[PDB]
Design a protein around this ligand. Structure first.
Ligand SMILES: NC(=O)c1ccc[n+]([C@@H]2O[C@H](COP(=O)([O-])OP(=O)(O)OC[C@H]3O[C@@H](n4cnc5c(N)ncnc54)[C@H](OP(=O)(O)O)[C@@H]3O)[C@@H](O)[C@H]2O)c1
Ligand SMILES: O=c1[nH]oc2cccc(Nc3cc(C(F)(F)F)cc(C(F)(F)F)c3)c12
Ligand SMILES: [Cl-]
Length: 318
């Protein structure tokens, strides 16, 4: 099952999340991405930030070489990291991502975050006192360079991630805009369901793509350990028992039924195989309303250190 993007391309509605923290050996990304394709995932979400594009690309090429899929059957996403927003850096960053993955094109290239950072080799450039160094970049010029990557055939579609309404409007209202973003990939789950942003995106022909749809990896470096564990929610657990599924499957199916494309990370073979069951059942309208009732404006990623960034996306209502 796919959704038609505003540029005519098609995006599978269930995507495999590939981020794993640095303590996980890089070889794991190759192993689990192969498992994901074998289980039925056809949309694969990576990024420069994840330091795994070589391994994720190897997995895609493995499943092509063994005859399981063709390149046209796979929807591969990468993302432009925030140290590469300056327009002259955009196409080389994409070409480097393609070289790592050994792919001729990505199906989707995203601006990973609106919060530009100092250009250089470091993913998180810091000054003398350990403070992250921001950069000021007109994201409309970044977007024009993204459009040129689409026209060059290096990205089939282009989109954004972690943008709020105001930041989307800045692109949408840009003079001489050639391609709208096809999507906005954002944190989205029953405790932070993004209903207003979803409505806005629908009104602009933009797909909302949910990350941390299972409640995030709860990495103690960026998630409060005292935050509620999404998959332990009593309503999700009751719905799982009713449908003979699992809380994770309820959380994924919720997004599909509200028009949201949903990512799911797992580095566990059994859970990878479980997650494709999202297509095997339906939630009732009443079930959906129960899940809607869980919304509590809870964002798992602790971005408070970036609150002073002029492009911090979470200060606006949506
Ligand atoms: N654009 C961005 O800024 C951004 C930010 C965050 C994430 N993302 C993308 O979105 C992907 C997913 O988001 P996420 O990484 O926050 O993780 P997630 O999808 O919310 O999953 C969180 C945890 O759920 C566990 N899990 C998976 N399937 C399960 C199941 N069936 N039952 C129980 N637990 C299950 C996984 O643990 P195991 O691995 O142990 O199964 C995983 O660590 C990322 O990998 C990345 O591709 C993008
Ligand atoms: O993409 C991802 N996959 O797994 C992840 C785990 C943690 C953070 C991620 N992304 C990210 C998003 C933001 C946001 F949302 F605030 F824009 C900021 C930053 C950072 F690190 F720059 F602060 C990183 C990702
Ligand atoms: Cl990298």
């Amino acid at each position: 099952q796919c959704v038609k993007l505003n540029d005519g391309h098609f995006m599978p509605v269930l995507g495999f999340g590939t981020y794993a923290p640095p303590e996980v050996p890089r070889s794991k990304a190759l192993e689990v991405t192969k498992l994901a394709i074998e289980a039925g995932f056809r949309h694969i979400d990576s990024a420069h930030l994840y330091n795994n594009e070589e391994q994720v690309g190897l997995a895609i090429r493995s499943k092509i070489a063994d005859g399981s899929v063709k390149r046209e059957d796979i929807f591969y996403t990468s993302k432009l990291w925030s140290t590469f927003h300056r327009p002259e850096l955009v196409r080389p960053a994409l070409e480097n991502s393609l070289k790592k993955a050994q792919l001729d094109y990505v199906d989707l290239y995203l601006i990973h975050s609106p919060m530009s950072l100092k250009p250089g080799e470091e993913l998180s450039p810091t000054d003398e006192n350990g403070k992250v160094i921001f950069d000021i970049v007109d994201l409309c010029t970044t977007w024009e360079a993204m459009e040129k990557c689409k026209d060059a055939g290096l990205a089939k579609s282009i989109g954004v991630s972690n943008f709020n309404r105001r930041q989307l409007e800045m692109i949408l209202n840009k003079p001489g805009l050639k391609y709208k973003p096809v999507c906005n990939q954002v944190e989205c789950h029953p405790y932070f369901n993004r209903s207003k942003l979803l409505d806005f995106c629908k009104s602009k022909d933009i797909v909302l793509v949910a990350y941390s749809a299972l409640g995030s990896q709860r990495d103690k470096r960026w998630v409060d350990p005292n935050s509620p564990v999404l998959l332990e929610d009593p309503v999700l657990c009751a719905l799982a028992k009713k449908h003979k599924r699992t809380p994770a499957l309820i959380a994924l199916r919720y997004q599909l039924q509200r028009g949201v494309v949903v990512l799911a990370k797992s580095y566990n073979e059994q859970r990878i195989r479980q997650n494709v069951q999202v297509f095997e059942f339906q939630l009732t309208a009443e079930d959906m309303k129960a899940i809607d009732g869980l919304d509590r404006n809870l964002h798992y990623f602790n971005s408070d250190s970036f609150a002073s960034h002029p492009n911090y996306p979470y200060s606006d209502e949506y």
